[PDB]
A and B are shown apart, each in its own frame.
Chain A
Amino acid sequence: PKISLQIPIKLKSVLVDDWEYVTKDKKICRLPADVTVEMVLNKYEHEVSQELESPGSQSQLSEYCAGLKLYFDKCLGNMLLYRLERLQYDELLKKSSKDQKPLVPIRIYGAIHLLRLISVLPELISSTTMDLQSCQLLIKQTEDFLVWLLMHVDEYFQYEGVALGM
């Protein structure tokens, strides 16, 4: 039993370059990112909704993009950070407390952390109670987003970070 999510090899390779830059070279992303998660998903929804005929097709894409923003805000600080990136996060969290303004991750982090989210989506789905057809739509919408991300791969893109038993 595997939740099958096809991630193009080029994008898997992007995730491994990122893993090397953080966990081997010890280089964190500059924050805020120039193109936040929110801007990536705004552009995607904005383009792809122009090539959909059905009205139900447009709602499901908007509910996908909105749900993916919502889930990135929940996951980021819980499961999308390398250990090395926690200081950066704990500092952002500290600025949020002092400036009395809540931390919204989709407005700080960028495309690579969104792709980290996608890479762990199959494992999250696997333990969840949901209708099979709801899972198949979730897989379809994500693979559509992925080949759009690959289409724009040049526009957007002591030991830790490997789970040997996974």
Chain B
Amino acid sequence: EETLLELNNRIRVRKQDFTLPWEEYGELILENARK
């Protein structure tokens, strides 16, 4: 069991603009349009 502090330099960082994934947030994004 390694903690996040010891995994810090093994979990690669992406270079990208931040997004929300559609499969998890799409229903909320569509409801948000109807406000």
- By a beta-carbon cutoff of 8 Å, the part of chain A in contact with chain B is 7, 9, 12-13, 15-17, 19-20, 60, 63-64, 66-68, 70-71, 74-75, 78-83, 116, 119-120, 123-125, 127-131, 133-134, 137-138, 141, 160-166
Contacts and interface: CB of A to CB of B under 8 A. Distances in A.
Contacts of B23: 166
Given A19-B29, A131-B2, A163 B13 contact: no
A9 B1 CA distance: 29
A81 B2 contact: no
Contacts of A166: 19, 21-23
Given A16-B25, A16-B29, A19-B20, A78 B4 contact: no
Contacts, number: 117
Contacts of A16: 20, 25, 28-29, 32
B1 to A, nearest CB: 5
B28 to A, nearest CB: 4
Interface residues of B, number: 28
Contacts of B11: 71, 124-125, 128, 130
B2 A130 contact: yes
A78 B32 contact: no
Nearest to B28: A16
Contact of B5 (A67, A129, A133, A164): A67
